[PDB]
Design a protein around this motif. Structure first.
Motif, PDB file in Angstrom:
ATOM      1  N   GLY E  54       0.761  -1.220   0.000  1.00 50.63           N
ATOM      2  CA  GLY E  54       0.000   0.000   0.000  1.00 50.63           C
ATOM      3  C   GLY E  54       0.796   1.276   0.000  1.00 50.63           C
ATOM      4  N   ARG E  55       1.622   1.473  -1.008  1.00 53.62           N
ATOM      5  CA  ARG E  55       2.247   2.762  -1.230  1.00 53.62           C
ATOM      6  C   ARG E  55       1.351   3.556  -2.165  1.00 53.62           C
ATOM      7  N   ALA E  56       1.844   4.685  -2.647  1.00 52.93           N
ATOM      8  CA  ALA E  56       1.112   5.418  -3.660  1.00 52.93           C
ATOM      9  C   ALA E  56       2.111   6.255  -4.426  1.00 52.93           C
ATOM     10  N   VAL E  57       2.108   6.122  -5.743  1.00 47.04           N
ATOM     11  CA  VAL E  57       3.120   6.725  -6.583  1.00 47.04           C
ATOM     12  C   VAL E  57       2.428   7.557  -7.649  1.00 47.04           C
ATOM     13  N   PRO E 300      -3.100  -2.953  -2.876  1.00 45.60           N
ATOM     14  CA  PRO E 300      -2.086  -2.962  -3.927  1.00 45.60           C
ATOM     15  C   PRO E 300      -1.301  -1.668  -3.974  1.00 45.60           C
ATOM     16  N   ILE E 301      -0.121  -1.753  -4.582  1.00 45.50           N
ATOM     17  CA  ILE E 301       0.779  -0.614  -4.723  1.00 45.50           C
ATOM     18  C   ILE E 301       0.219   0.273  -5.826  1.00 45.50           C
ATOM     19  N   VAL E 302      -0.443   1.351  -5.442  1.00 47.24           N
ATOM     20  CA  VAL E 302      -1.219   2.150  -6.379  1.00 47.24           C
ATOM     21  C   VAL E 302      -0.302   3.086  -7.149  1.00 47.24           C
ATOM     22  N   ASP E 330       0.384  14.564   1.110  1.00 45.46           N
ATOM     23  CA  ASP E 330       1.354  14.223   2.142  1.00 45.46           C
ATOM     24  C   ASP E 330       1.628  12.735   2.202  1.00 45.46           C
ATOM     25  N   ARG E 331       0.839  11.928   1.510  1.00 44.82           N
ATOM     26  CA  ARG E 331       0.915  10.489   1.613  1.00 44.82           C
ATOM     27  C   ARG E 331       1.595   9.849   0.416  1.00 44.82           C
ATOM     28  N   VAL E 332       1.592  10.500  -0.737  1.00 47.92           N
ATOM     29  CA  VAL E 332       2.071   9.894  -1.953  1.00 47.92           C
ATOM     30  C   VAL E 332       3.511  10.323  -2.197  1.00 47.92           C
ATOM     31  N   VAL E 333       4.168   9.660  -3.129  1.00 44.02           N
ATOM     32  CA  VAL E 333       5.460  10.085  -3.634  1.00 44.02           C
ATOM     33  C   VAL E 333       5.329  10.417  -5.107  1.00 44.02           C
TER      34      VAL E 333
END
Ligand SMILES: Nc1ncnc2c1ncn2[C@@H]1O[C@H](COP(=O)(O)OP(=O)(O)O)[C@@H](O)[C@H]1O
Ligand SMILES: Nc1ncnc2c1ncn2[C@@H]1O[C@H](COP(=O)(O)OP(=O)(O)O)[C@@H](O)[C@H]1O
Ligand SMILES: Nc1ncnc2c1ncn2[C@@H]1O[C@H](COP(=O)(O)OP(=O)(O)O)[C@@H](O)[C@H]1O
Ligand SMILES: Nc1ncnc2c1ncn2[C@@H]1O[C@H](COP(=O)(O)OP(=O)(O)O)[C@@H](O)[C@H]1O
Lengths: 77, 77, 438, 441, 437, 459
Positions: E54-57, E300-302, E330-333
């Motif tokens: 659970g990342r976010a790109v 999933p890695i969004v 603030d949550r995503v890269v």
């Protein structure tokens, strides 16, 4: 009221009406088996199935007046 | 009239004049269909679309009858 | 043969070298737009296209949709052409990003060749052979013929009420049967039976003809999702059980592509990529130019001819950005934009002559100049809508051809929008009992 | 019996001449309007021609200047042949379906297909029926019938005896055995067997025997629109939808295939296409999402001629915010062709009130008619046309025969015209709820 | 054959070195976007590891720079093992299911369950049905090689009766469940009948051994398990779409049983990739759910894309960078992209040339490079096809300067269309009025 | 059939993996760096008081607000409470944007989530005869009825489990089961006690080869008892009772066999049904059979609920049977979504805010971010040197908290690609330019993205 039908003056229209608006497969599936079919299924040498395995009409949820609209005075009144 | 209701006004009655309705019936309901067992048996082995069919309590014939009847006949089944 | 607004459009009217020629095939002038649409037609026929967008600029009154019907009659009846306006994308049963894919799947065509072997004739006997296979003798007026039936087509004959001597119509290939009637040799068996007494067909019993016939992929999608038409008898209730349009998922389309590619690899069917003509694309809002930017990038997508007449307007659904054509510049860079310039005064007269000899309305040369005067000074859509009423004012007054007097009467009987606006403002001055209600 | 006197029950056609198109000033109800009725006559004569597309004529004009009157005149001057369909433009905003598709069905309702095919029917009084149900069944039977001329015996199939005990054909009925299907429509009862009917009412109609031959062919002519065929070919038994409105979004491939088979019916000579008239009443109640579809539904070969009526001046378009003449966008006003009407001169007001008085059969003195014309000069046609119906009843209060000034002056006293009602609102501000305040004495 | 040359057709994987993560410039279609491709390679290498959940790109940048190209490169360079989901944001706004559930199903599609098993099936053509009316019977089945006689007891004779199996059919029996699946008839009996029915489809004979056992690797998703357990015959719902707000208790039972299968060694969980294309179309009512669905173990890695600058957020009325709320940013890269030099534009047009098998003279390629620098990629790539087609009309093999100038003369780039609109304002419907000359 | 893989049974790292509880004393005083948390003393003490309120069964409709800015630990305290209460007390973590449905009104999904948040524990017994049938042997009666043929007084069944077999004498009116269900020798059945009608499960596995092709399910022998007298604890949420009373699951007709065959639609539930179910659950508690257990309805992002929902929440919280409502709001002065009139604190209306025990949440000190980095790094397994920890703490103080916890995965990937095992300063200094924050993204967006042109953004 009865449902609206088509006044088309061929024989095929009458056959299609009596095969859709009546459609005896659903009627047989809804009301149950013929007693002749019950006899040939219950006097045979081997167990056999029935295409309406029981009467698939739902039980009406109002005992005194079921599936009609025809009422009568009440000895009560 | 008997032209529209019987002869060739209906797009489903495959009479002469409605020459499409035989072809369209066969090549949409039995040849180019994704529920016929031949078109399922080739797509059952991995990432493909009917991967899950081995695990639900059905068979190919269960799925093929279930994808052509009504809600009525499927309820009788 | 009835006249529409685009009856006189027959084709683009090009050379052999792809150069437009003036006053050809119904068009008058408009050179570069017809050259560009000819290039578009060649791109559609070249089959090297998996999603291309073509926008048509130019204001109202110019010939934008005449170019589209020129393309539609230039391709022919073979390659499918789906014209939809923007406002048809809104429904109350599906989302509006699914009706777009339904139009894309109506655009692609799938041509199948069949050799239908039809059997007309009177039943001679119904003999069950095995104990199963049931022979049927089909008597024509040229000779009877035996016929061996499968044990599943006989259960389709038997559902129909065919008994002894009913004429029937058996499809051999698709297995489709219809009872036409009772033959007139058995007509007066009884005296008031109720059947349709038809004569025995005076042709062959085995007619063999071939039919080329098209299927769109959206029809494959619908026929594989829900049972349609034939055995769908519970749909006569109507409320919840009707064939409501449902959200066709991506998995179903991804499998129907596999099955259609299988039947193309066997050499059965042929594939033809179509054209989607979305007209007045400003009515498409920003929740669909997002989805088009994805859906055109599939390797299966058809060409999209967009038409738009607006200037720098507000994109619907997002009120805080202006863009050209009502098209977001996120999407506008994809499109091939074709201009559509206005009409010179010497190119309106030829449109008047062609539109006059389309409707059959013949008229003198002193009236063609007056219709061209109204075409220059008011509009083009209005001057072409005086050729048909004035002929009605021509054959009533004992004439055949239209003179200046009938058009001078029709300009007073049939006011345009501009003079009606002048009467609406200036003459309708005070808002009272006998005034307009703004 | 369902012919109650409405606000347009006096119009019996457009009233114009059909030879030189002259609007004669008083005929068939429409009295006074000349130039607009001649233009409507031209439009009417190019509707029955058929060799034109779906075009658009906008009947613009002030309130109560006879716009629905001209449309109803064109409706009465066509008969039950070319399909006229009224559409007040708020039947489109439904919830059973979308809005553009609800407009498309209203376009498809006005393109008739007219086909003519024959049937074989039988008139006649039944003399007697004998049915050999003896345990037997419906196997054989004899039917003896007659007209005034003929008399005959027929033998019956099993599927006809099952229709004879289905309709219970007596000895004396006047039946119509349609031979090709088998239905039995009892046209009535014969008079000569009036004794033989016991299970009937005391008041019961009786006919005579049918005259002529007993076996004849009828050339019936049916006419159904394309929306009829669309709704028929949409479900299993789907024609009930067009009697119950439960049709939904009809898929467009069905409409395309029916547009193909109608052309194949026309080219084989089996059919004939009749373009109708669609009257969109109050067209200003459409948003721009409608006009962006009417601009392209008026393009195809199969499109009815649209007649439409607008009241508003420079007003806003719904959906958007910018104003426009007649409440319509300018790219759609390029399509339409506008007929403007005019307010009415007082003598025309007087004879319109005379026609509305003769329609309801109310006697008027000429002094009361002069007073009523004087009222209608200052309060419109609708107010005076209601004062007629009020004044007849007020004269019937005190048992009078003809209305007079002493009853029109009572109807003008009790029922306010809307100008004095606006004055009443303006002079009773503090108690009527404007937006915020309620003051109680 | 339902596969035509789209815009994303030359991108056969991401095209980086798998050892040291060095984005060599011209490899596997992609050209010269080295830092973003390196960052996507790092993302892909933490996708295939599958531990970090659970990342976010976010992939920002100008239009016509390659944000969906890198996404399709990551889609191609995973294989059929790890899932991938192309969902543009306007798909969520439905009229049968709400925004929350139609975005939960986007997360439930991108996690696979992988299970390996042995299928004990039996193909075969029926030769002779032998029923002993005494209960018993014998079935004779053949293939192209073998022929055998198997006994039958009581009830599958009744299954044959309910299926109506004639001599000549192609039956298949799953012996682990025991149900006859009639596949059709054989070509050896097409000569027998003359007027066939509707349901009969002809097939070749089965080949090889009757008893076929094979180890097959099934891979379903969690969304499959959610929709199958929705209603009774609910398996056809995922093809049809006739499903709605699935209850949370069903999804809770399903996540508990997938954890139980992972404990007992039956199943292997394969996390995948959700691709939310054009994320700026989501309103704040969707970001308030994405900020919670990136917390569970089954997420999933969004990977998401975006175009817009400081723009308004739909659903509210305040500007923000990238069209996204700041509690979500603030949550995503964020991986920024950059526009292209002409040296990259030339070889991107060369790759688009060799994909469409269109030959170009070098002068035409230089002219098309200048047109792409002055108008963009999406207009320059749309002139290769047009110049090829105009060369095909005048019957020339190689396209030239004349055909590219003809294609530039006919079709307008979006840079000149704005000057065409602002040049003639009195006829285009701006907001109020049209002149109509 | 299904082949078992002998791989490693690890788990996945979420954002709240390291949280394992509150980490309190035996007196309630919090202690820093314990059970995952770093600092945040008063909030953990207040949440411990909330946990004590929940386990003491004195909460009957309270409400707790979690204020504080984004990225400070509200959801961390929520998962800490959910892992502190355990598993046998319910926990339904809905969000604010999950009440908006298209089948029901949005003041109904709230009530269904209340009913999901309440559990009911029922302790009962289960008395079944079990196993594979060996004999079905009748016994002739002593006095046969005149006029009939056979007269059978006691029917004998030999049931064989996987541990021991047993002969069973039964009342003869088991025959209507056996004929209707087709029970033969070699079919496992279960016979209940309250009615006594056997229902076949399937053919046993020992008789899986007497025939060859005639196959069905071949269930194994019941590996257990033959006479189960086993007691059962059974947890049912009141949502499940509402659904099973509203939409019945299994019927025998056409239309209920279309109802489970068509899609299940969420329907609104009338309040008489809920009142009756509460009145009967409060009766079965007084009989001493069922235990009521209230749970937590953690409505995350409570500023997405509009003003039409808090009005229903006032009614629902005044009910005598209701769980705790732990809200979670991270806004200051905000406009409430429904009524665009009043600017209230936290997005909560001032009428509803008085019910709430407001727990604050403070920002983190610049020497606690590095402790969170150490705990998160030893949670994932990514080990790294101390200068790398100081650089990540520098990025954590100067930019964000959630951003310094996301420079650990690409640094570890670049570390084990470059050829090392631990993360140094070079890998983070290289991974800080492949993954920009929001701040440098907005700087590129404003500075380089000047206006809408060719090579520019779309404002
Ligand atoms: N080159 C042309 N030759 C003949 N008629 C034309 C030409 N261009 C336009 N027209 C006329 O223009 C009308 C169509 O205008 P249209 O293209 O529909 O405007 P818009 O696309 O803005 O709605 C048709 O009546 C057609 O007769
Ligand atoms: N030419 C006419 N002849 C007879 N009656 C008329 C005529 N014009 C108008 N009327 C009457 O005036 C009334 C108003 O006409 P109508 O068309 O309904 O007004 P509007 O155009 O506001 O709808 C109608 O009731 C009609 O009876
Ligand atoms: N590095 C590259 N090498 C080759 N082609 C590229 C490269 N980057 C982008 N493209 C092409 O440019 C086009 C635009 O990229 P895309 O991601 O669609 O832009 P946007 O992000 O504006 O949607 C794509 O069709 C892709 O084929
Ligand atoms: N006291 C703490 N100890 C350890 N980690 C924390 C602490 N507080 C917050 N975090 C971490 O900060 C991250 C973001 O906090 P979050 O719970 O998202 O804030 P909010 O509750 O405002 O959404 C979480 O991943 C959590 O792991």
């Amino acid at each position: 009221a009865p449902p609206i039908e088509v006044v088309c003056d061929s024989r095929s229209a009458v056959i299609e009406r009596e095969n859709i608006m009546f459609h005896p497969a659903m009627r047989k599936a809804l009301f149950g088996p013929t007693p002749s079919e019950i006899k040939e299924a219950s006097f045979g040498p081997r167990p056999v199935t029935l295409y309406p395995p029981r009467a698939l009409l739902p039980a009406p949820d109002h005992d005194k007046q079921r599936f009609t609209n025809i009422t009568v005075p009440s000895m009560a009144r | 009239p008997r032209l529209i209701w019987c002869d060739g006004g209906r797009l489903d009655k495959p009479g002469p004049g409605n020459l499409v309705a035989g072809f369209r019936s066969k090549y949409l309901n039995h040849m180019m269909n994704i529920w016929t067992p031949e078109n399922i048996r080739s797509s059952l082995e991995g990432i493909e679309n009917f991967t899950w069919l081995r695990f639900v309590d059905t068979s190919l014939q269960e799925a093929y009858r279930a994808s052509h009847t009504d809600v009525f006949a499927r309820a009788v089944d | 043969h009835r006249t529409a607004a685009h009856t006189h459009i027959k084709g683009l009217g090009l050379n052999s070298s792809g150069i437009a020629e003036k006053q050809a095939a119904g068009f008058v002038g408009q050179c570069a737009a017809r050259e560009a649409c000819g290039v578009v037609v060649d791109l559609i026929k070249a089959h090297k296209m998996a999603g291309r967008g073509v926008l048509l600029a130019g204001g109202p009154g110019t010939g934008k949709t005449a170019l589209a019907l020129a393309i539609s009659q230039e391709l022919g009846t073979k390659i499918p052409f789906c014209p939809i306006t923007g406002s048809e994308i809104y429904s109350t049963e599906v989302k509006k990003t699914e009706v777009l894919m339904e139009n894309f799947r109506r655009a692609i065509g799938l041509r199948v060749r069949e050799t239908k072997d039809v059997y007309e004739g009177e039943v001679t006997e119904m003999t069950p052979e095995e104990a199963s296979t049931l022979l049927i003798g089909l008597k024509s007026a040229r000779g009877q013929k035996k016929l061996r039936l499968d044990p599943s087509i006989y259960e389709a004959i038997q559902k129909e009420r065919v008994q002894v001597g009913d004429v029937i119509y058996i499809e051999t290939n698709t297995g489709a049967c219809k009872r036409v009637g009772r033959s007139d040799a058995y007509a007066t068996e009884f005296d008031l039976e109720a059947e349709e007494y038809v004569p025995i067909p005076k042709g062959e019993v085995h007619k063999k003809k071939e039919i080329v016939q098209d299927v769109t992929l959206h029809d494959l999608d619908v026929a594989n999702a829900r049972p349609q038409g034939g055995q769908d008898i519970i749909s006569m209730m109507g409320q919840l059980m009707k064939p409501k349009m449902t959200e066709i998922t991506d998995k179903l389309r991804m499998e129907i592509n596999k099955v259609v590619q299988k039947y193309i690899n066997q050499g059965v069917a042929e594939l033809i990529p179509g054209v989607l003509f979305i007209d007045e694309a400003h009515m498409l809002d920003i929740e669909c130019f997002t989805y088009l930017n994805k859906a055109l990038e599939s390797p299966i997508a058809p060409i999209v001819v967009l038409a738009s007449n607006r200037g720098i307007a507000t994109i619907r659904g997002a009120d805080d950005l202006k863009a050209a054509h009502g098209i977001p510049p996120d999407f506008l860079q994809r499109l091939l934009i074709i201009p559509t310039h206005p009409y010179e005064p010497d190119e309106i007269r030829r449109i008047v002559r062609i539109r006059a000899q389309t409707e059959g309305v013949q008229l003198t040369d002193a009236a063609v100049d007056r219709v061209a005067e109204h075409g220059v000074r008011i509009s083009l859509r209005y001057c072409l809508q005086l050729l048909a009423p004035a002929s009605i004012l021509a054959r009533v007054n004992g004439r055949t051809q239209v003179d200046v007097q009938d058009i001078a009467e029709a300009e007073e009987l049939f006011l345009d929008a501009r003079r009606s606006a002048n009467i609406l403002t200036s003459t309708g001055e005070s808002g009272g009992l006998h005034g307009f209600i703004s | 019996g369902l012919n109650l006197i409405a606000a347009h029950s006096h119009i019996r056609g457009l009233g114009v001449d059909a030879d030189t198109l002259e609007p004669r000033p008083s005929s068939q109800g429409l009295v006074g309007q000349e130039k607009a009725r001649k233009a409507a006559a031209v439009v009417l004569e190019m509707i029955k021609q058929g060799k034109i597309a779906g075009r658009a004529v906008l009947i613009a004009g002030p309130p109560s200047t006879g716009k629905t009157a001209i449309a109803m005149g064109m409706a009465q001057s066509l008969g039950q042949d070319v399909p006229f369909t009224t559409l007040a433009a708020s039947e489109i905003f439904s919830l059973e379906m979308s809005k553009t598709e609800a407009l498309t069905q209203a376009f498809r309702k006005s393109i008739g297909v007219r086909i003519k095919e024959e049937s074989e029917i039988m008139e006649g009084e039944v003399v007697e029926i004998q049915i050999d149900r003896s345990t037997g069944g419906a196997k054989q039977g004899k039917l003896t019938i007659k007209t005034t001329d003929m008399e005959a015996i027929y033998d019956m199939g099993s599927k006809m005896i099952d229709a004879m005990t289905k309709e219970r054909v007596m000895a004396g009925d006047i039946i119509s055995i349609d031979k090709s299907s088998g239905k039995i429509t009892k046209l009535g009862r014969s008079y000569a067997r009036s004794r033989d009917y016991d299970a009937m009412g005391v008041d019961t109609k009786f006919l005579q025997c049918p005259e002529g031959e007993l076996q004849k062919r009828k050339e019936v002519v049916h006419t159904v629109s394309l929306h009829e065929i669309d709704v028929i070919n949409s479900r299993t038994q789907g024609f009930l939808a067009l009697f119950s409105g439960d049709t939904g979004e009809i898929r467009s491939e069905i409409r395309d295939q029916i547009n193909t088979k109608v052309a194949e019916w026309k080219e084989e000579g089996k059919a004939e296409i009749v373009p109708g008239v669609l009257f969109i009443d109050e067209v200003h109640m459409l948003d721009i999402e409608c006009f962006s579809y009417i601009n392209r539904a008026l393009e195809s070969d199969l499109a009815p001629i649209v007649i439409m009526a607008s009241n508003r001046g420079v007003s806003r378009i719904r959906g958007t915010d910018y104003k426009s003449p007649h409440g319509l966008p300018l790219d759609f006003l390029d399509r339409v062709v506008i007929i403007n009407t005019h307010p009415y001169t007082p003598d025309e007001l007087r004879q319109i009130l005379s026609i509305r008085a003769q329609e309801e059969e109310v006697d008027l003195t000429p002094d009361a008619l002069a007073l009523l014309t004087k009222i209608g000069q200052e309060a419109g046609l609708r107010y005076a046309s209601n004062l007629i119906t009020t004044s007849q009843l007020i004269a019937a209060k005190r048992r009078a025969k003809q209305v007079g000034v002493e009853d029109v002056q009572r109807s003008f006293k009790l029922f306010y015209d809307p100008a004095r009602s606006v004055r009443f609102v303006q002079e009773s501000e503090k108690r009527l709820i404007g937006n915020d305040g309620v003051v109680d004495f």
